[PDB]
Symmetry: C3
Subunit: 479 residues, 3 copies
């Protein structure tokens, strides 16, 4: 990966990050009370809010239920503890690898799950936003209720036949709002929805304001709850669910990471360059992975990026074409360019105190000393340090330079207009039909250059006939 | 379609679904009072909240309002109805067919909107989050107020002039929130904003806590309320507005669906294959429609998906090349592929108990009877069933296999490297540049082959004069 | 740009808009009181929610604070003679143009940021939702606090020991919810996270319910709050921060838009046309920018759009191919078409009263005069005006057309103009052409052979002559 040489067609390494992989996945358990608890006593009042919200979050979770059920019915992990073997995966119908992985993790968590739903009665009757779940002075985990705090702060100490409508109103408000938010993250599309991942998004919905407390509680680490809540390291799998109690057990995994050595992930941005009288930019991957002499396109989409680090749980590398590699590795005659409509924002960056600009599409005016800086055609973009200028101006934006670049250049860079391609499907599809046309010109041309041959070969046959007759009439002369 | 064939190249049918079209909707009329009622008595103070709120909400609706007004005037103007034909669509300006359908729908509801809006004052001074609406035995619709119960549970049954500023500041903290939620869904960008459909996303902001209630009573249907709230089947269109009263009549529709016969919607996954010493993936549409001898690409990205069913009001079929068409219909030699960087997640898939995997790129370690499973280059993917393995170890995954695969075979498929194409545009472009260099070099070739053709016409002339002068010195010999 | 020719193949200009260029900004200052003030007396009770909130939030801001101070220490404007010339930019490291713009912005607002931050003690002790910030009878900015009101509505008049539990509960439940939101908009992936623009989405979260009120307070203009809040005009930058007090200074900017002359942003949509037994669709930019003789693709994706006007901070202009430029300018034989499975939805539009449709694909049933409209092969689309049909029916729709043609204008289009645009079908084609180039290469290499032979024949000639030149030479006597 030759960066030095790549900066001479505007290709700027914005930041260099270290790649991360997971050694083991630290875990914790979570019970979600879907129904809030009442401490107030109810008399001569049928609170209609609840017999409905019950029915509906029950309907909403009926798939995840029947699936947790069908699977647990046909898991059967032989011995498990220690290392066992899962039996009868055909129960999943068709499944992907990530789905099968989760199918087995469901089976392991089975125990800790049942251990938790064992105590559903306690958990239900307990009134808290965030309670501990205890058995034998050990914690099986945390149980949460996203609205309880809010319920507590609003019901009458006593529900009477006077309070009825007014209570069943504002309970309904709170209930039906949380029910609307559950109706996003719980649409059922697929065949084994129990196995579906719970995003850090779906989690913020389920736990509500309880989330920060649970993150501080469920995991202990050098990681701050700040960066832990903010990134997307956290993930969950539904591992247990009782409908009648509306309690839903969720395994939550925080992966322990470590550097993968001799690998870097480098983001590439491109300023505009001036080459063969067009304003273009390099056509390269915006971020690649580099291990030794290997290079691939590394878009970290779902992945967790930080100033010095990328954690990809997954791996979505794309392969790089032969020119593209060549391009990245020094041979600039294989870099591919494309016309762009430059702009101030896209026509220069700033690198450790030095200016890499396209000083031709854009005006580079030096202040000390003041001389409009012209960019030669043998230079696609322009480097600017202390020597070329101690005080730059650019439009309204002005600054000084203390920085000096290590020479390390030695001109020049020759690139043919054939390195300037369409990158657009339509543009390309057009350039293709053109070549096809040209090729049909060369086909009709051949068929025509083959009628000439048939001619010429036939004129040679006449010359042979003439020659057989002369040479024979010479034999006729025997004297 | 030949799903059997495709499997042998890593192409897996994940879902098969009925396709459902819409043969008529059921509708409900909601009215949204954006201004909640304040029953409690005042004393010598102005509630600044309701001031800036009346102002700011009213101005936000102005485009929707002015446009509602125009169309209603120019299409069917205080004439005696209707039904049948709509007049003067020129008022729309430039309209899409959806916008034209909306317009007819608006003037078709004109009367029922008018009916509900007669009672604007009864409604507006009624204190209910969810208010029924009836006209002397005639069910007209349903009034709703989004923040009603959250102001019911804060209002001090009397407002002094000393507790004024203090209760102003907390009505204008809730009013301002529900306001901020409104500034999102009500931009004005297009020419006829009153025709823009209301999405379920938008209905959730407008109706807030009231939505599941509305959904429950608005439609008498078999479909659950959990389904409706969570799906996408719900859509709305504004049919009436009154800025003074800040009420908005919204019509809400629920499509009645029927299964489209002899059609299925098929999802196709690709695991990676090993072909001509490469790891690749087949390049095909990930979801397709199939009916009779037909096959179209059907990415139902905006449609509603359940496990058996795909409802699509919007029919967006992509049409397929004859190459792809032949690939899916059986002829594997026409298929295309592209290089990929396999991961554990993409190298396999489990299919009714039977593993399909790239046992080249990935180690298929069979545990009992212990063996590395090898994958002959003849086979692009391996089919693991009871015979090849009984208990399989794919990294952390250990699991039995007890079934036998259907014997449609044999492994006699040969695949050209001319079948491994690029799909990234940048690559496809480079490849085109390379074909064009190659045509340009086959054009310099026929040029030179035309130069020889001229040079030989020269020689064979110069030969023809030699034979003359020769024939003549023969004639010249008379003795 | 021949729009009227374009319409003949179903290319419809559905919007015509002005374009606005950024001129100046209107700067306003905000201070987010992150920590709400609590007037209730506490007695023998450690409200734990505060200290967790206080800590968790302080950690969350570590990057922005550091990167704030790092730049303030290193940058310094401070010029001399006589412009806004700046020193020491190597503190930003590798940073893009737009962020260097943000850094000089950051370094101008020093004096005013530090002036506001001098009043920090006063601000933190003032229990107010929205609240002005003054020094020497001068309004410097507004001091907001997203939860102050909700707090006040629920915290008990005096916090006792029989109180603590329900009280620490309800207060954490406010503090945490707001804290959770804080984490969706604060996450450093990048080098200098203090120059990261603050979206309108961020403000709605960062200021909560104070946002409407604080927007009318800070901006004198003819754009109302409705417009101001509904659009993407509102941008913010972080210009200061005190971690001890949990107060963050934010500079809102509201642009000043002036019309760009001779420039227009036209939206092109496409109905489906019938061309050579094929249902197809012109392949054009959905959106373009036209200054007289010039045409660029202008799909304004991150720009504010009103029915008459379009504003962008910078440009998303892309350069058009020559064929499409030719197609846009009236040469219909330079157009590119691809096949589609059109719907009722893409088979017609309405243009100021007149119906432009595909009466081949879709049934254009005419209710008066009661006949079916058939579309000729010469015609890609049909133009139905009042003369064609006064009363139309398209599926379930029935309407009238009373407006009149304005004919003005036929065009012949080659099946070759139909191409794929989906990178796969293109790639399969590029292969099929390479396979043909191989036929031409073999045909060249094979005629290469009929040329070395046939040059063997002339060498036979040359010799067979030389030998009848031996005779005829020795036949001299
Ligand atoms: C938390 C809760 O409300 N649970 C109840 C459950 O006991 C009851 O049997 C079920 C059926 O109505 O409805 C629900
Ligand atoms: C690019 C492509 O589709 N191939 C075409 C071929 O079908 C056509 O017969 C010929 C005529 O120009 O040109 C080439
Ligand atoms: C329900 C409501 O608040 N609507 C009022 C309306 O009655 C009044 O005429 C107008 C004056 O601007 O302000 C608004
Ligand atoms: C004002 C506020 O809420 N912030 C406090 C701050 O006073 C204190 O010095 C700091 C010590 O860790 O804790 C936090």
């Amino acid at each position: 990966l030759d960066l030095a040489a790549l900066m001479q067609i505007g290709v700027i390494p914005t930041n260099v990050r270290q790649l991360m992989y997971y050694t083991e996945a630290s875990s914790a358990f979570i019970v979600v009370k879907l129904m809030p608890t009442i401490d107030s006593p109810i008399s001569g009042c049928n609170i209609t809010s609840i017999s409905s919200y019950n029915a509906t979050v029950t309907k909403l979770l009926q798939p995840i239920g029947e699936n947790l059920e069908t699977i647990r019915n046909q898991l059967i992990p032989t011995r498990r503890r220690f290392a066992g073997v899962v039996i009868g995966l055909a129960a999943l119908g068709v499944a992907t690898a990530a789905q099968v992985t989760a199918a087995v993790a469901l089976v392991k968590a089975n125990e800790n799950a049942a251990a938790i739903l064992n105590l559903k009665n306690a958990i239900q009757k307990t009134n808290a936003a965030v309670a501990d779940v205890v058995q034998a002075t050990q914690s099986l985990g945390t149980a949460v209720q996203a609205v309880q705090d809010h319920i507590n702060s609003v019901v009458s100490p006593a529900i009477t036949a006077a309070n009825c409508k007014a209570q069943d109103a504002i309970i309904g408000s709170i209930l039906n709002l949380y029910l609307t938010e559950l109706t996003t993250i719980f649409h059922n599309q697929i065949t084994n929805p129990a196995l579906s991942p719970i995003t850090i998004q779906a989690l913020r919905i389920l736990l509500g304001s309880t989330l920060p407390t649970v993150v501080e509680k469920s995991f202990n680490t050098q990681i701050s709850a700040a960066e832990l809540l903010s990134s997307g390291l956290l993930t969950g799998q539904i591992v247990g669910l009782d409908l009648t109690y509306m309690q839903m057990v969720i395994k939550i995994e925080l992966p322990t990471l470590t550097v993968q050595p001799a690998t870097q992930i480098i983001d590439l941005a491109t300023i505009s360059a001036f080459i063969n009288n067009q304003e273009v930019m390099a056509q390269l991957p915006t971020r690649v992975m580099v291990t030794g002499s290997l290079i691939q396109a590394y878009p970290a989409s779902q992945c967790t990026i930080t100033p010095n680090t990328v954690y990809c749980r997954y791996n979505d590398a794309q392969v790089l074409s032969d020119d593209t590699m060549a391009c990245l590795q020094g041979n600039l005659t294989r870099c591919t360019f494309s016309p762009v409509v430059g702009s101030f924002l896209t026509r220069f960056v700033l690198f450790d105190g030095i200016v890499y600009a396209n000083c031709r599409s854009m005006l580079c005016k030096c202040m000390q000393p003041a001389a409009v800086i012209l960019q030669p055609s043998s230079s696609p973009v322009t480097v600017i340090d202390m020597y070329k200028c101690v005080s730059l101006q650019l439009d309204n934006l002005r600054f000084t330079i203390t920085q000096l670049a290590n020479v390390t250049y030695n001109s020049t860079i020759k690139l043919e207009s054939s390195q300037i391609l369409p990158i657009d499907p339509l543009d390309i599809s057009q350039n293709l039909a053109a070549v096809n046309k040209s090729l049909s010109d060369a086909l009709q041309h051949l068929a025509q250059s083959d009628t000439y041959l048939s001619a010429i070969e036939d004129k040679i046959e006449e010359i042979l006939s003439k020659i057989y007759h002369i040479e024979n009439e010479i034999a006729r002369i025997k004297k």
